[PDB]
Design a protein around this ligand. Structure first.
Ligand SMILES: Cc1cc2nc3c(=O)[nH]c(=O)nc-3n(C[C@H](O)[C@H](O)[C@H](O)COP(=O)(O)O)c2cc1C
Ligand SMILES: CCCCCCCCOCCOCCOCCOCCOCCO
Ligand SMILES: CCCCCCCCOCCOCCOCCOCCOCCO
Ligand SMILES: C/C(O)=C(\C#N)C(=O)Nc1ccc(C(F)(F)F)cc1
Ligand SMILES: O=C(O)c1cc(=O)[nH]c(=O)[nH]1
Length: 371
């Protein structure tokens, strides 16, 4: 075993320990601290050119990135990317820093590889996170192994903010220049009233405001693409067909660059250890629900809006199911929690194998093949 490799057995011993004894958020923060101090293992393999993917000019070296919320403040972007991910969606930052809901607010259920959280948009604020992203961009600029890595920024509203657009615009003005794309978060179930912004009418206004604000912002782009950040919207899977269809029409009207399918769900209640817990559920129990959601939106949007998959992706098989359902790229969170540091290297290898086995010459060919 190569001790610098994410697959080094020692990291699995650590993973077992963490999962067995350590509080969810404490472990998470410890992990981010390890990454901040750059003492995490890293992937040294070269990514298959056959598994590269894209969403317009956004070129991902591999189809795996880490979902929003994992590095809410962008404290160790480099370290996380070097685990083998092609991109990371930092934050889900708010104009002002806020503490989030009362702890403990993150619980694991290993048997079902599920997580439930009621974090509440805890983050250091757009100002501080921008500084962290700026530091990364400068670092990315001197390093070359990160030149093609992508960083997206998830944005939301502060707990008391009346008009979400006011917060979105503030964040864009501050960090938009350093983002490869912006993720409009209107699907968190831990911020009262936030999900109402998924109503076709409101969502349309929000998306246009975000796009205009990005244009109004426009060496210029200190990001990877060297172009203005694309716009994605992250949706909750707890919507009825009518709602999804109306949203689908808005996404086409607003010509949104992409849609991150499925944030956590609130319709799961078959998990024993989560009965007395609040928040959104992530993990295996969310996979089918979110995959189906992808199928629907892919159809409802006539395969015109690129999809970033999120929800219960742990293996290459799970990723292929998301891909064949219409997803062009995948985001992981729970996988990192349950499979640990070897998450990226492992899932990439699995997907390459599976793509080969099934007879695909590349990953793109598989996108939507479940038609
Ligand atoms: C502790 C925790 C915090 C999260 N924070 C955010 C966030 O700030 N913004 C966001 O868009 N999603 C957030 N998510 C949702 C994940 O990005 C992802 O959509 C969801 O967990 C489904 O992926 P998974 O099944 O692979 O875990 C969070 C999830 C967890 C478990
Ligand atoms: C200090 C050494 C402790 C060793 C414990 C050995 C347990 C044997 O499991 C072997 C396979 O582990 C592979 C890595 O898995 C990491 C994630 O483990 C999930 C929980 O596993 C529970 C059983 O250990
Ligand atoms: C099912 C019961 C499992 C019990 C497991 C006991 C595990 C104790 O874990 C200690 C080993 O983890 C090593 C730490 O690696 C993570 C960070 O690496 C940074 C470098 O650290 C070197 C000093 O450890
Ligand atoms: C609930 C929870 O456990 C988390 C969250 N969020 C989390 O990041 N955990 C977590 C993060 C990293 C590891 C490892 F180091 F092993 F790779 C293990 C667990
Ligand atoms: O910060 C949070 O509570 C949060 C945000 C989000 O988008 N999803 C989630 O499950 N939690």
């Amino acid at each position: 075993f190569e001790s610098y490799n994410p697959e080094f057995f020692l990291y699995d011993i650590f993973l077992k320990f963490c999962l067995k004894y350590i509080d969810g958020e404490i472990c998470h923060d410890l992990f981010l601290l390890l990454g901040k101090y750059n003492i995490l293992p890293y992937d040294t393999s070269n990514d298959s050119i056959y598994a590269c993917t894209n969403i317009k000019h956004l070129d991902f070296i591999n189809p795996f990135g880490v979902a929003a919320g994992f590095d809410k403040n962008g404290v160790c972007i480099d370290s996380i990317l070097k685990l083998g991910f092609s991109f990371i969606e930092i934050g889900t930052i708010t104009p002002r820093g806020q503490t989030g809901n009362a702890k403990p607010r993150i619980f694991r259920d290993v048997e079902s590889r599920s997580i439930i959280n009621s974090c509440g948009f805890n983050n250091m604020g757009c100002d501080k996170v921008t500084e962290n992203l700026i530091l990364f961009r400068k670092r990315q600029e001197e390093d070359k192994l990160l030149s093609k890595h992508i960083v997206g920024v998830s944005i939301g509203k502060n707990k008391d903010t009346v008009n979400i657009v006011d917060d979105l615009k503030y964040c864009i003005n501050k960090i938009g220049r350093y983002a490869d794309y912006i993720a409009i978060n209107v699907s968190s179930p831990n911020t009262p009233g936030l999900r109402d912004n998924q109503e076709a009418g409101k969502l349309k206004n929000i998306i246009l405001s975000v796009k205009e604000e990005i244009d109004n912002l426009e060496f210029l782009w200190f990001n990877t693409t060297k172009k203005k950040p694309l716009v994605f919207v992250k949706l909750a899977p707890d919507l009825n067909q009518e709602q999804k269809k109306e949203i689908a029409d808005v996404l086409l009207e607003t010509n949104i660059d992409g849609m991150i399918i499925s944030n956590t769900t609130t319709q799961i209640n078959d998990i024993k250890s989560f009965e007395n817990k609040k928040g959104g559920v992530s993990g295996a129990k969310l996979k089918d629900i979110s995959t189906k959601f992808i199928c629907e939106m892919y159809n409802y949007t006539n395969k015109q809006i690129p999809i970033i998959a999120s929800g219960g992706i742990f293996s290459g098989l799970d990723a292929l199911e998301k891909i064949e359902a219409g997803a062009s790229v995948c985001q992981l969170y729970s996988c990192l929690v349950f499979n640990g540091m070897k998450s990226a290297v492992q899932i990439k290898r699995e997907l390459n194998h599976l793509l080969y086995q099934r007879g695909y010459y590349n990953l793109k060919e598989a996108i939507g093949r479940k038609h």
